[PDB]
Each structure stands twice: as structure tokens, then as C-alpha cells.
Design a protein around this nucleic acid. Sequence first.
RNA 1: ACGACCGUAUAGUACGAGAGGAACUACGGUUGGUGGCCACUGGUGUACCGGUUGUUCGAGAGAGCACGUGCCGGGUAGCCA
RNA 2: CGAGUGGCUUGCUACCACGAUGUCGGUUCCCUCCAUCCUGCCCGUGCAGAAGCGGGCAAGGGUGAGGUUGUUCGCCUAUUA
RNA 3: GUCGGGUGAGAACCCCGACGGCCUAAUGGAUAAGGGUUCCUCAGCACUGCUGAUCAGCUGAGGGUUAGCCGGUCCUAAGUCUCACCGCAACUCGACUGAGACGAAAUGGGAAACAGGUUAAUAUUCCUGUGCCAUCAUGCAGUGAAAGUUGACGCCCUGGGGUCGAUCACGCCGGGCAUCGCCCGGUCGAACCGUCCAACUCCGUGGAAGCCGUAAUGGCAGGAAGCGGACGAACGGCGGCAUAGGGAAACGUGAUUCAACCUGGGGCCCAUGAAAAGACGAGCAUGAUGUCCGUACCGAGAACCGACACAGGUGUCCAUGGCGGCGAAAGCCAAGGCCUGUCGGGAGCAACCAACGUUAGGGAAUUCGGCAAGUUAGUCCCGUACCUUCGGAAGAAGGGAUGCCUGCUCCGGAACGGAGCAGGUCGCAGUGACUCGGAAGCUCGGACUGUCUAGUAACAACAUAGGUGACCGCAAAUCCGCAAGGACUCGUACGGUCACUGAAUCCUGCCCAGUGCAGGUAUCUGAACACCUCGUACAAGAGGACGAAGGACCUGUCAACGGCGGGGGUCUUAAGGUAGCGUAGUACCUUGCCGCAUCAGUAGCGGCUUGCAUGAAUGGAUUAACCAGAGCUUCACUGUCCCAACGUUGGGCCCGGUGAACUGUACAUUCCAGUGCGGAGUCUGGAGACACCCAGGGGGAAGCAAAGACCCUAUGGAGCUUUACUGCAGGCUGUCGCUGAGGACUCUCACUCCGGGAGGAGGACACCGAUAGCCGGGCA
RNA 4: CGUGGAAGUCUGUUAGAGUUGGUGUCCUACAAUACCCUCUCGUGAUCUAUGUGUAGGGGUGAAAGGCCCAUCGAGUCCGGCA
Lengths: 73, 237, 56
Amino acid sequence: SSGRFGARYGRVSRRRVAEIESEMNEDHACPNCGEDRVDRQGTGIWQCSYCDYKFTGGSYKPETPGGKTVRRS
Amino acid sequence: GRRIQGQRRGRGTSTFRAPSHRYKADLEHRKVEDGDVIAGTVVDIEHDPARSAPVAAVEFEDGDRRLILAPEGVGVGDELQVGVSAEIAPGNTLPLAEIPEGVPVCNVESSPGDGGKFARASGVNAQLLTHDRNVAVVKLPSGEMKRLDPQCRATIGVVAGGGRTDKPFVKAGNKHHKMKARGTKWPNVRGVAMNAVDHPFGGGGRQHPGKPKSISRNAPPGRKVGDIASKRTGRGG
Amino acid sequence: TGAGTPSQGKKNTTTHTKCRRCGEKSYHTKKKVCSSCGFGKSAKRRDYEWQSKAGE
RNA sequence: ACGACCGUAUAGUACGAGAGGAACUACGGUUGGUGGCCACUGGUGUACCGGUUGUUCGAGAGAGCACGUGCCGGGUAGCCA
RNA sequence: CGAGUGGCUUGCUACCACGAUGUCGGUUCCCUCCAUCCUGCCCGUGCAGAAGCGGGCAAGGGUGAGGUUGUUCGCCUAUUA
RNA sequence: GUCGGGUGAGAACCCCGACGGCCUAAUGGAUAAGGGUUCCUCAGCACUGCUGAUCAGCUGAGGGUUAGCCGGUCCUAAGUCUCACCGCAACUCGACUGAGACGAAAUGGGAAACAGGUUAAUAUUCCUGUGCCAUCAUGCAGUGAAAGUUGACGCCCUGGGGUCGAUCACGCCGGGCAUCGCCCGGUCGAACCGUCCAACUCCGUGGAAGCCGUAAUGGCAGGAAGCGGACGAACGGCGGCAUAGGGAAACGUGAUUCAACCUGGGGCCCAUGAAAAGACGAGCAUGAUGUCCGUACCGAGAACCGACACAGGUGUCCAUGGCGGCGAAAGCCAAGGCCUGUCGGGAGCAACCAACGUUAGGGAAUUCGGCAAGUUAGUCCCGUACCUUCGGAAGAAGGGAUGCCUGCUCCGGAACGGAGCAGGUCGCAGUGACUCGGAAGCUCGGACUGUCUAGUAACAACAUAGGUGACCGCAAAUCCGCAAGGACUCGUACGGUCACUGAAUCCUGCCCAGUGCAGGUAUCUGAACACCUCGUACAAGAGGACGAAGGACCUGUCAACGGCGGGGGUCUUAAGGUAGCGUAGUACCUUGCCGCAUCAGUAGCGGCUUGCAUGAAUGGAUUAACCAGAGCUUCACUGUCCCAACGUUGGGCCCGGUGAACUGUACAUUCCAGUGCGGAGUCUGGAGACACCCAGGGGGAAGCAAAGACCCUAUGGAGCUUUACUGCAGGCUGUCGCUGAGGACUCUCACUCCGGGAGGAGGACACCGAUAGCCGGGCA
RNA sequence: CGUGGAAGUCUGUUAGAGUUGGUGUCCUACAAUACCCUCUCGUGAUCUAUGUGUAGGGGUGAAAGGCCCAUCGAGUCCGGCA
Ligand SMILES: [Cl-]
Ligand SMILES: [Cl-]
Ligand SMILES: [Cl-]
Ligand SMILES: [K+]
Ligand SMILES: [Mg+2]
Ligand SMILES: [Mg+2]
Ligand SMILES: [Mg+2]
Ligand SMILES: [Mg+2]
Ligand SMILES: [Mg+2]
Ligand SMILES: [Mg+2]
Ligand SMILES: [Mg+2]
Ligand SMILES: [Mg+2]
Ligand SMILES: [Mg+2]
Ligand SMILES: [Mg+2]
Ligand SMILES: [Mg+2]
Ligand SMILES: [Mg+2]
Ligand SMILES: [Mg+2]
Ligand SMILES: [Mg+2]
Ligand SMILES: [Mg+2]
Ligand SMILES: [Mg+2]
Ligand SMILES: [Mg+2]
Ligand SMILES: [Mg+2]
Ligand SMILES: [Mg+2]
Ligand SMILES: [Mg+2]
Ligand SMILES: [Mg+2]
Ligand SMILES: [Mg+2]
Ligand SMILES: [Mg+2]
Ligand SMILES: [Mg+2]
Ligand SMILES: [Mg+2]
Ligand SMILES: [Mg+2]
Ligand SMILES: [Mg+2]
Ligand SMILES: [Mg+2]
Ligand SMILES: [Mg+2]
Ligand SMILES: [Mg+2]
Ligand SMILES: [Mg+2]
Ligand SMILES: [Mg+2]
Ligand SMILES: [Mg+2]
Ligand SMILES: [Mg+2]
Ligand code: NA
Ligand code: NA
Ligand code: NA
Ligand code: NA
Ligand code: NA
Ligand code: NA
Ligand code: NA
Ligand code: NA
Ligand code: NA
Ligand code: NA
Ligand code: NA
Ligand code: NA
Ligand code: NA
Ligand code: NA
Ligand code: NA
Ligand code: NA
Ligand code: NA
Ligand SMILES: [Sr+2]
Ligand SMILES: [Sr+2]
Ligand SMILES: [Sr+2]
Ligand SMILES: [Sr+2]
Ligand SMILES: [Sr+2]
Ligand SMILES: [Sr+2]
Ligand SMILES: [Sr+2]
Ligand SMILES: [Sr+2]
Ligand SMILES: [Sr+2]
Ligand SMILES: [Sr+2]
Ligand SMILES: [Sr+2]
Ligand SMILES: [Sr+2]
Ligand SMILES: [Sr+2]
Ligand SMILES: [Sr+2]
Ligand SMILES: [Sr+2]
Ligand SMILES: [Sr+2]
Ligand SMILES: [Sr+2]
Ligand SMILES: [Sr+2]
Ligand SMILES: [Sr+2]
Ligand SMILES: [Sr+2]
Ligand SMILES: [Sr+2]
Ligand SMILES: [Sr+2]
Ligand SMILES: [Sr+2]
Ligand SMILES: [Sr+2]
Ligand SMILES: [Sr+2]
Ligand SMILES: [Sr+2]
Ligand SMILES: [Sr+2]
Ligand SMILES: [Sr+2]
Ligand SMILES: [Sr+2]
Ligand SMILES: [Sr+2]
Ligand SMILES: [Sr+2]
Ligand SMILES: [Sr+2]
Ligand SMILES: [Sr+2]
Ligand SMILES: [Sr+2]
Ligand SMILES: [Sr+2]
Ligand SMILES: [Sr+2]
Ligand SMILES: [Sr+2]
Ligand SMILES: [Sr+2]
Ligand SMILES: [Sr+2]
Ligand SMILES: [Sr+2]
Ligand SMILES: [Sr+2]
Ligand SMILES: [Sr+2]
Ligand SMILES: [Sr+2]
């Protein structure tokens, strides 16, 4: 997915942008409906195209390891 | 010589100032007399230009509309509470005394009623540990154990936008844009690449500091550069 | 680009204008201050001892 | 304002065991220089003649412009090597 | 060992110029010197010849093209009288 | 530009016609700034105009700018000022907080005007016609009234609606041409009023379990398609406006592609893309009122800035005129503009110079170096190496095709869109001009796009992502201020400050002795105040005791400054150079040795390498991609060269007119020698020499230009450094004041901070004032 | 295979910005930094108009001691000053 960077930037930089952006663009399960329809709206902003649930979450992932802890306690 | 870059800063000229007129809102804890009876519905989620993180728009019962330091997992429609009796859920804000031990907290107050000071940046969080009638021990994001007044308010949960710093900027342009939203002069010219007239490390036939980098704490501004009161340097040892 | 002739070309900004108070074309219309009599800066008239030789 | 060299005959001779190998002289040419000339060869030749692209003058005919010939082909006199 | 000439090298001096006498190399173009590389005429030879070696008179003409190097100098190649 | 003609005392350049040309994002049209009357008319030529002048941006006199609806005015933006408060010795000074005001003329927001006519000069301003907005008054309706909507918003891709224009078809009106029958122009008509509505959204029906839909994404039993319906757009269509206007006339009709304008879908952000006034919400009639300021002209190779009528500089809109072609490209041509990038006449027009064309054979031999020039080129088809971070390298390289004419096929709704086929056919040449890469390899540097010495440096330098270390829990660290106060900060460690290194990949050894920083510290040292002894009727002063930071001392630390040798088989001073790399952009010796390549190679490349004096974030090595970066090799090409020639244009030369400057102690026709402060036209001796003028290329006048930049000197200057001398800020620390009650401790009442408040935290500390010790090129 | 249309992406005298070589022309200039050809960037750390802020031991500086009105290793004016 980091093919836009051409032959520039080097392995590490574009390997990370690809991984991060790949997981960012993945189908995400909405906390409301449960449908895989959550898409990134901005930095840390997520929204379900199905039920319109707009919520906060990681900058590139809807859920972060730290966020998944808040529940358990 | 001439005043170094760090000295031009303090003057507060446009170049060094933050784009305050472009910032949305000062995210401070709402005030309540007592009793808690205060709740609001999240009407929207916005982007905060001053912190590169999501901030939630809330509308309280008394018809009060204000932006809030949004934790992770706060959606539109969600009902938030603020007060002593505020339900122990993510997004709610109650004094540390009412917050259970071992629970991740964000936007922690330094002194009760200040509106929150600690743990506000993307994805971080404080950690409430010890309880008492006098002091609530919080473990701040830097790892420091901070003893606080149990009456200091603080939101439950971790701050939204976590993991932001995990992706590299890749190019100067990306930094450029982020920098334009902060009170920071960028790019950065190494002192070693300047003239002696401009910086303590300036001058010489080849670039290298003409003295050791570790400077005394008592050094005057204009000379306090490099490694300030470094307890040590390097990785080894 | 040269600092001389090629840079004189952009000079179409108006600053110093006829002053309401003193009548000199020294009223900086962007600063709203007269460089000659100090109108806009002080109630008293701009005047300095160095405007003449010390013993005069 | 002429300097110098190669070649041929002299001669496979004189000389020398042999190997090898001259000269005088008479010739032919080359090179460098020099002065001049253009029949010849070559260059130029925005004189000239033709071909042809784009566009404008309605088409045709016949023309302008495309840098001081649009481009391509041929090229007289002269000037030249 | 001893006697000299030159004024291309270098060193020495500090006379000249610091109200400026523009650098090295190269180039281009002109004149000159002889301590002659070739060419002319000669003497000697450890001069048969051929080819050389040493020397003398002699400055008319000639002394060219290239590879590295800014190079001068020099190294190298093929031609050359 | 030329030929006629006009006016005039006078005409190359003032005017008319014709012919001939130039400008096409400009040399055309509208403007902002800035200019300020430069605008128009009349009369002039003393001035100004690169020549002339009857002309004029010149001289003089007159005249000229008309607004409810075009700007200003109103609003708010970054931000500014004023007042108050506070500081300051003080102010015309100074930060904060309040209040108020200012802050947008092309180009932020914003009530409302269109079309025509008229002048020598204005014009949505005047006049004609038609229209619109606001306030107010009266009348009627109306009691709704303010929630909400609007003003009001980033970047990239894209659909749909759709006007101007352009083009196609055909008809009408007029013009042109004259083998043809083709070619050009026109065929009009606003604001405004009324009306229509696509998209979006929603509603009812319907009942899809696989269908609906898109350029694409997508949608759905949480209810798909289909059917009906609410809401709802254009600067658009339609009707009026209009027996208005406009035209000599006709006074069209359809289509395609569609700027403007309208309305949607999608994608991106460690970036989040103004505010306020105002409008809407919220009717109609009639009438009144709508003041004030701007308005001429230029807007540039003559109206602006640059001393100039300066080849420079200077914002916006016309980006859709035709052919062409991918094109807002070239070239050519309209509309419109101009012959004022404003001196002419003459010589086949010499030398010489500028800019340029063509050169036979050779082909980089030129040169520091292919500098300069040339070569190549568009488009389609075939084909394409090493290496590589798998993206790329790559248009690698290399090869073929290319026009016109005839008749066709395919894609598409179609284009005046595209892709092909068969036949015929011309040239030396079919991207025929124009437009339009030369190609390949090796090495060095920096990863990359980016930055820089305005005016000799564009680079390897700066930056960058990335890597790393340092400081700080915010009453912070860092920084500004004399103070009052302030930046960072609408920020909070995933932060931001201070530094270093400089993408990726493989790595980054040893040294804490010195210097730096930091922690500790029994003991040693360590100021002042208070306290103690001596002294003094008091005082100066001498000494003691206690002892802060600081130092001594101990420890930590090198991705801190830096270091990593000599001798021998440990010495200094801590260690003694590990991976690597290596004759290096670092190697003196040096053209090192071997090899490659060449006829020949101080060059280049590889190998060796004891390295004068390489080496690991003073980062080492290495490297795809990128580069107006340094070096080298090859193919191709060629006037760079052998070696020069001829030609073209502008000068150069002669003539009319205009008309400077540099320079000048005097004398001066010199030459060869000598002499001289040792580098003489001028002295000495000779030689030569009739005067004057034209052209030339520059040998000399140690030519002209600049009180030499180099070197030295001056008890000259400045910028910069530091363990130079001396001081000054600043930081740290003790002490006194503020400061209070009961060598360690409690408290609350000053004082500080948090808190809207109540009250909470802290607390005689901290802040502040004063003094003392330490650090202190930050500064003088 | 198609769809899509990413990029401090490419070619490009689109506009615009820049300034490599000619060590060309000019060098009492057209010009106290100009002319021509060649060359670089041209969707972005882009370019640009107007408004606005920062002031002299002070600004500003992707750092050249660069720039702060032809003035910069400390602007300019007047004064100190004969
Ligand atoms: Cl950052
Ligand atoms: Cl106006
Ligand atoms: Cl769509
Ligand atoms: K001298
Ligand atoms: Mg806040
Ligand atoms: Mg900024
Ligand atoms: Mg840097
Ligand atoms: Mg430097
Ligand atoms: Mg310094
Ligand atoms: Mg370095
Ligand atoms: Mg360094
Ligand atoms: Mg001289
Ligand atoms: Mg002799
Ligand atoms: Mg001779
Ligand atoms: Mg007249
Ligand atoms: Mg007019
Ligand atoms: Mg002129
Ligand atoms: Mg030839
Ligand atoms: Mg040569
Ligand atoms: Mg070239
Ligand atoms: Mg079809
Ligand atoms: Mg090298
Ligand atoms: Mg670079
Ligand atoms: Mg420069
Ligand atoms: Mg460059
Ligand atoms: Mg980082
Ligand atoms: Mg970093
Ligand atoms: Mg960095
Ligand atoms: Mg660097
Ligand atoms: Mg080697
Ligand atoms: Mg190391
Ligand atoms: Mg001098
Ligand atoms: Mg010197
Ligand atoms: Mg000095
Ligand atoms: Mg406070
Ligand atoms: Mg000093
Ligand atoms: Mg500006
Ligand atoms: Mg320097
Ligand atoms: Na001698
Ligand atoms: Na020389
Ligand atoms: Na001779
Ligand atoms: Na040589
Ligand atoms: Na004229
Ligand atoms: Na309509
Ligand atoms: Na066209
Ligand atoms: Na680029
Ligand atoms: Na050490
Ligand atoms: Na080292
Ligand atoms: Na570049
Ligand atoms: Na030529
Ligand atoms: Na001369
Ligand atoms: Na100096
Ligand atoms: Na694909
Ligand atoms: Na240039
Ligand atoms: Na100064
Ligand atoms: Sr706050
Ligand atoms: Sr607050
Ligand atoms: Sr230095
Ligand atoms: Sr280590
Ligand atoms: Sr220019
Ligand atoms: Sr300007
Ligand atoms: Sr004032
Ligand atoms: Sr005074
Ligand atoms: Sr013979
Ligand atoms: Sr024989
Ligand atoms: Sr022609
Ligand atoms: Sr061609
Ligand atoms: Sr002799
Ligand atoms: Sr001889
Ligand atoms: Sr020499
Ligand atoms: Sr040598
Ligand atoms: Sr105009
Ligand atoms: Sr006259
Ligand atoms: Sr006029
Ligand atoms: Sr105003
Ligand atoms: Sr406006
Ligand atoms: Sr369309
Ligand atoms: Sr006008
Ligand atoms: Sr111009
Ligand atoms: Sr015309
Ligand atoms: Sr004239
Ligand atoms: Sr010819
Ligand atoms: Sr060569
Ligand atoms: Sr050569
Ligand atoms: Sr080809
Ligand atoms: Sr590197
Ligand atoms: Sr510049
Ligand atoms: Sr690296
Ligand atoms: Sr140490
Ligand atoms: Sr080793
Ligand atoms: Sr001359
Ligand atoms: Sr680009
Ligand atoms: Sr140069
Ligand atoms: Sr010229
Ligand atoms: Sr010049
Ligand atoms: Sr040229
Ligand atoms: Sr480009
Ligand atoms: Sr003075």
C-alpha cells in the first residue's frame, strides 16, 4: 500500500506505513450494531457507515491495547 | 555575540507563538456545586488542533454546550456524568476519592478544581493506586508516583487517539504541517553548524562542539545549551 | 534578484502622508504617527536637543 | 624565396673472407615555405529553378508568413583551397 | 687541483616602485643569441666498407604530431634530416 | 515601411488613401496600487521629445468627473490604538486585565439596476424605458416572534443539470469571388415578475433471503426494487417584460461539446480548513424619504517605482476567437491595437566586430575539460540488461512503422471522437515546417523532494524523515522583561524544551586518567549576620566558635569534550584501534607496485596496502532510487581541431541632423646605445626625421581607472575565542527584614497558591527587599 | 484481467517560480546586477497580492555572518564632534 512512496523513504518507514494503514483500512466491528462497517473519519475518529455511530479510538486503530484495559477493571 | 535561538523564543514573537486563534477550546473539567446531578449527551466528536487528538462535543442538562477531553471509546449519543455520585464508567468525571483503585484515569487535576492537568496527550493515562482519607496515589504516564488530594477530579479511561506516535512522519512535509499547528519554530539548525557569534557550539574548521555538551544548571541563558545538567550521557554503562 | 533597480519596482505603498497637526508629509498612515512632530504619539511636540549643535 | 627529404640509373658495383655495402653524376618525385591563379576537382553561392509540411488569401491559379532561405534537392557568375 | 666566462637555475642584498609596473602555465605574433640537434664544408678515428664516435667553421633554413599532468620540468608513443 | 495626396513659411517621421508589415495571456479589453489633471478643446513651438515637427504626456488658456440599488460608508480578521489599572526616578516608555474604538475600495462578509440613448470630455451616475431594496407614514391583514436556518468556509478524484462560446445541419437577410461553387458576415433582445425541477433527505405502499445501483465506492428484513407522495436548484428552461430597445435587412430552427452557474458521490489529515454584522424565519396597498465621500485620465518598452519618454521592476480578471495539435505548446490568422521597442541618407556595402547559415576528406587530432556547437526527437508496434529497498532500473538498449487518394470495418447515443482494413499512388525526404531525449558503463559525494551566499560560490554546505542523549509532574523544564508582567500554553511526558547524528541495510569495539556534568561525603576547607575573648568608659581592630552552597575526597557517565601510542617479549597518561575501510576529496614519500585501457594514460577503474597523519552517531561500512554536484571510458555526432572559405543580418566607412565623457605639469617627429634613485620621447653620443589628414589592429607612454587588497609599521579600529587582565548580568547558597503563637518539632494570624463560593492546600517557609560566599566569555 | 486515481511522482518556456553553462552580449550599460540562448522546479516544506507582527548588540535567519529600503562581522539620521 506504500507504493505511492515510489523508491523513496526506505524499508522501515514504508513497511510501517503499510502495516499501520492496512490495519487502519480493515473492516472493523461496530460497538453498536456489530457490523464490520467502521471506517476512519480523522485522527482518532471512527464512524459506522451502517448505524452512524461516531466515536473516539486510537489514531489508526479503533481500539488500542490501553483502551481494552479500561473494560476489565 | 548574538542572542541564541532559545533567547529569541521568550520574546513571544509570531514565529514562536502558537496559533491560538486557530484552537478550538480549553478542555477543562466542568464545575458542580455538589451532589453530582449533572449529565450530558455527546452531540459530536471533533478534531482538536492543539493536541492532534479527538475531542468530544457534549450538551449538558442545563443547556450547556462545551468541548471535552475525550477518552477512548466515546461515541455520539453516549451519556456522560460529572460529580461525586457520577457512575463509575469510562468518560465520566468524579473526584479520585470516588474512583476505585487500579483504574486508568485521564485529565487529572493537580489541585482540586483546576480543571485537569496531568495525562491529556494522545493515548496516555494515569493510574490510581492507593486510597486514603488524605492522599490518593496516582502513577502518572512518566512512571512517577504522584501523591494527590483525593478531592482532585479526573476522567475515567485512557485518552483517545492512542498509538498516534507509532507511525513515522516519513517526510519533512508531514512534520511541517504538524509543526504549523504548534508554538514551535521549525526546522531545526544544529548549533554546531552555526557561527561562533550565533551559538556556543558555533565556529571551527569542522563541525564539532568546542567544549563538552553537559552544562551546569547554574549556567546563564545564552550559554545553557546542549545537555542541560545531564546526570549522565550515552546508552552504555 | 538585485536589491537595486529591480527592487525599486515594488514601491507603490503609501506610508508617510501630509500631517493633520504639523502639515509635514511625515504622518505614517499605517502607524498613525507623525515622524516629524510626533502627532499620534504625544500631546507634546516632537523636539530634540540634537536637532542643533550643542552650544546652540 | 627558397629549405629539406625519398626514390631510380651509377650498383648488388667500389670496399670486404663473408655478412654487408657506398660515391661522383644525371634524373623522377615528396615535404615545409613562398608568390599568383580558378580551365580542372572541391566549398559557398538567404542570384536562381524545383519538391514539399502548417496556415492565411473561398477552391484552382498565384502568392505572404514559419528570422532575417520554413524545410528538403540542384546550383550559374564571383570569391575561394 | 687550479684559472675563468655567462647571467638560463638557486641563494644573497634591500638600491627602485606599496596615491598598484596585473600571477604561473598555455596560446598567438614579431626580432634576436650560439654554448649547433639537423642541414653545408671540414679534421681525427680503436677511419676496409656500411654505420658510427670525437672535434672544427658555421645561426641561411629547419627543429614537427600525439597519451597522463594546470603544470614549467619531465615520463611515454609513433613518425623525422 | 512605400507611393500618391492633405495642411503649412517650413514636412522622412502631423493627417487621408492605397500597398506592405508588426502584436495574439499581448503591443488587444477591464482594473488595483501608485501618479494627479497627465483627460477634452483651442491657440502655440522659447522649453521638453535620442534627428525634424505644422505633432505631443511639452507651453498657455478655457472646459471636463452628476449615483437609494458601482465602490466607500456597516461587519468582523491577523492585529492596532485610546481610556482605566499597574510599573517606572520619570515619560512621548512598559506587559496583563477590563471597557471602547480602529483594522478589508482589485481580493473576506454585505439590502437593492437592467437595457438603450446622449457628450469634444462623465455615465448601472445624465436622458428614455422597465425594474428592485430599505426605512418611515397611512390602510388592511396580523398577533404569531424565536427556535431554527442562513451569512459560513480545507485539499484530491468524480457524476449529474446547464448558459456563453465554438462547431455541425438547414432556412432567411447582406457581402465577396468569378472556369469551379465555394467563402465571409448577420439572422438580436436584459434586469426583473411568474413558472418548471434534477440531486440530496424524508414519508406511504411494496416485501426482495439475493437482488437494486455506480464512472467509482456502494445499498438492503434496522425493509432492497418497483409505485405514489412531501421537501427541494441554476447567473438554466419556459411565459411575460417587448406594436421596449436595437438592426440596412433578415430580424432562424435543431444538434453536439459544453466556461459560467446549480446540485451530488467518493477519498485524505500526527494538517481539521475565520469571525462578526446582516438576512431568513415573518403578509399586502398606497405615499414619503434614501443625505455624505469616490467617479477625468494612465495603468506602462512615454502617465506607477527605478535621478530619464530606463530593454529593469509592478497584483487582478478576460484560460473558450479560427486552423493546428495532447495542449492555455509551436507556427499561421481574426477581432482589437500598432508602424513610437521613434533619427535618417549612401557605398555589392572593404578590414574588422556582433548574431548566424553552409562547408569537401578526416572526426575531439582541439581543450584543464567536447567549453561551444552538433546529434537525438512526436506517435504506434516489437523488444529491453546489470542492479534493486521489488517501488524501481525503463522512454534502458535495440528494431520496424509514419504522407496522399479510393472504398470500408470496429467502439460509442454521437462528435466537426477514437482504433483498425483493402486497393491505388507521389517524393531524395511523410512527427516533410513547426513542435520534438542523444545513448551506455565505471568511480566519488549527499539518501530522496527541499534550502543558500538579493549583486563572482547552488555544492559534497543548510534542512529532512529516521537514530540518540539531556532536562522537566506544570507553583515544572526552557526562554523574554528594570518592573508591572510575558512566550511556550485553548499545551501536560504518545508532552515540549536543549542538543547531537542524519533515509534504508549491516553495525556502532576499548578508555572515566584529564576536562565537563551529576550524585555522595567520616573527615579537611569554606563568607557574612548573630554569638564568644582581647582591645576601646564607646568605636575602629585583633582572635575564637559554628559552618551553607562550593572545593578537597569518593562514585556514576563517552550516541559528554575527547583518546585508542612508544619501547619490549610493561612506559606515559585511562585505554592502546575491535567490524570495517584504506595511496582515500584523508598517503608526505608518489606518477607507490601489479593488472585493465590506449600507439603512448602523473588521469580513471580493480587488486595489494606497514594507514607521513583511516576507523565506528567527532558515526564506520554499504547502497537501489534521485542530481544544472566532482572524476573516467565507449557508441553516435560535429568547423573544437587539421584549415580555413563563401554567404546572411546589424554595425563598421561616406553624407544631413543631434551631440557627450574619460584624460590633460610643461615641452613632444622618433630610433639605437649609453647614462641616471639600478625600467628615459625630454640627459649624452650617434642615427633617422618636409608638413597635414584618413582607416587600422593596440608595441610603448613602467597607458587610463582605484591614497595596494599582499608584506611590514602604528603604545590604530572592529568582529570573534579562551583555563589573558578586570569587571558586569544571571544561577546556586547562608544571613537580616516581611515574621506570628506553642538543634530538632507543633501551630495559625501575616504572606502564597487552588477554589465561583463556601472552603481547601501551604505556612512563617516561599515570594519580594538587603547583604554575603561559589559558579559565571552569557555580556562589557 | 478490469475498475480506481495515489504521489514533498514524472515530461512540460500552461501560468508561475528559479537561475546551470556560455566564463557569450553589455561593462562612460537599456540597466549602480541589464540582454539572449541553455538549464531547474512547476499539487506543494509550492508560488503570489494586500493587510499585519518582530527593531539595532536588537529582529529575522532550512546558517551564507545571509537579510533588516543600492547601507550589515552590528542599519539609517542627527548629535557628542572642531
Ligand atoms: Cl512533533
Ligand atoms: Cl470605485
Ligand atoms: Cl455519483
Ligand atoms: K609596486
Ligand atoms: Mg484545556
Ligand atoms: Mg508557527
Ligand atoms: Mg538539523
Ligand atoms: Mg558556516
Ligand atoms: Mg560565543
Ligand atoms: Mg559532521
Ligand atoms: Mg560532528
Ligand atoms: Mg602596464
Ligand atoms: Mg663556434
Ligand atoms: Mg636568423
Ligand atoms: Mg491641434
Ligand atoms: Mg472616457
Ligand atoms: Mg520610448
Ligand atoms: Mg566537414
Ligand atoms: Mg594538443
Ligand atoms: Mg553544452
Ligand atoms: Mg457502432
Ligand atoms: Mg578518486
Ligand atoms: Mg542533496
Ligand atoms: Mg552570489
Ligand atoms: Mg543547484
Ligand atoms: Mg522522534
Ligand atoms: Mg528525534
Ligand atoms: Mg533529528
Ligand atoms: Mg550533511
Ligand atoms: Mg588502489
Ligand atoms: Mg563509540
Ligand atoms: Mg597604500
Ligand atoms: Mg592580511
Ligand atoms: Mg582591537
Ligand atoms: Mg492566580
Ligand atoms: Mg569579549
Ligand atoms: Mg506580507
Ligand atoms: Mg565563514
Ligand atoms: Na663570471
Ligand atoms: Na602566461
Ligand atoms: Na642556422
Ligand atoms: Na606532454
Ligand atoms: Na520619428
Ligand atoms: Na427563471
Ligand atoms: Na482549438
Ligand atoms: Na521535485
Ligand atoms: Na575521563
Ligand atoms: Na579517532
Ligand atoms: Na535539488
Ligand atoms: Na562555421
Ligand atoms: Na598602444
Ligand atoms: Na571586524
Ligand atoms: Na489493481
Ligand atoms: Na542564467
Ligand atoms: Na547596531
Ligand atoms: Sr487549564
Ligand atoms: Sr480555570
Ligand atoms: Sr564549534
Ligand atoms: Sr557501550
Ligand atoms: Sr530579471
Ligand atoms: Sr508592491
Ligand atoms: Sr502613542
Ligand atoms: Sr524635547
Ligand atoms: Sr641508391
Ligand atoms: Sr645481400
Ligand atoms: Sr521569409
Ligand atoms: Sr526536423
Ligand atoms: Sr661564434
Ligand atoms: Sr652538420
Ligand atoms: Sr618557470
Ligand atoms: Sr615532476
Ligand atoms: Sr485599460
Ligand atoms: Sr521652430
Ligand atoms: Sr492627448
Ligand atoms: Sr470600520
Ligand atoms: Sr468586497
Ligand atoms: Sr456534462
Ligand atoms: Sr472610467
Ligand atoms: Sr513592462
Ligand atoms: Sr486586424
Ligand atoms: Sr523622434
Ligand atoms: Sr546549398
Ligand atoms: Sr579529447
Ligand atoms: Sr587531447
Ligand atoms: Sr526507434
Ligand atoms: Sr551514509
Ligand atoms: Sr534568494
Ligand atoms: Sr543510517
Ligand atoms: Sr570524569
Ligand atoms: Sr586492525
Ligand atoms: Sr580603433
Ligand atoms: Sr512533482
Ligand atoms: Sr562561471
Ligand atoms: Sr548589447
Ligand atoms: Sr556586469
Ligand atoms: Sr551561444
Ligand atoms: Sr517539471
Ligand atoms: Sr560630528
